[PDB]
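Bug report

Summary: structure tokens for Spermidine N1-acetyltransferase differ between web form and batch submission.
Environment: batch mode, default settings.
Steps: 1) Submit the sequence below via batch. 2) Compare with the web form result.

Sequence submitted:
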Amino acid sequence: KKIRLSALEREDLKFVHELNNNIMSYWFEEPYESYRELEDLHIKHIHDQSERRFIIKDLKDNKVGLVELTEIDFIHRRCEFAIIISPGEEGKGYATEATDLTVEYAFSILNLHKIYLLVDEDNPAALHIYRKSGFAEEGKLVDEYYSKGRYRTAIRMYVLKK
């Protein structure tokens, strides 16, 4: 309502790249750095339903941020949720609106069952927002990731349908 979701197109790639310059970034599980890389990967996997991405646009249709549905499995019906918001739009949290919206798309459209996501121990802020979205921790992964000199630990939270 304060925001809308747009299906990612080719013209949106530039914006995506600009975001991830802020860490190893993956496109369909294939890592990339340069724009050209991403550009190629986009075309290559374009018909792959394995993942789905949306651009978050404000009322003015400026590009607010990104949301990624990855690791989609149509048997177990689960996808990994991830969301990124531009450094300018971090003000009154721009996640919940977008977040809860995608969750509907997942359940009410893709007809999925469970959605999960990963967050650092050290990012409590967004950790709450997720819980206020109906998420709850199903696990805590020790040394699951390596970021900035030290193995980090990520919290895995989920939500069911119905």
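Above is the batch result. After comparison, the two runs are identical; trailing whitespace caused the diff. The longest helix spans residues 95-109. The domain at 1-162 is CATH 3.40.630.30 (Aminopeptidase).
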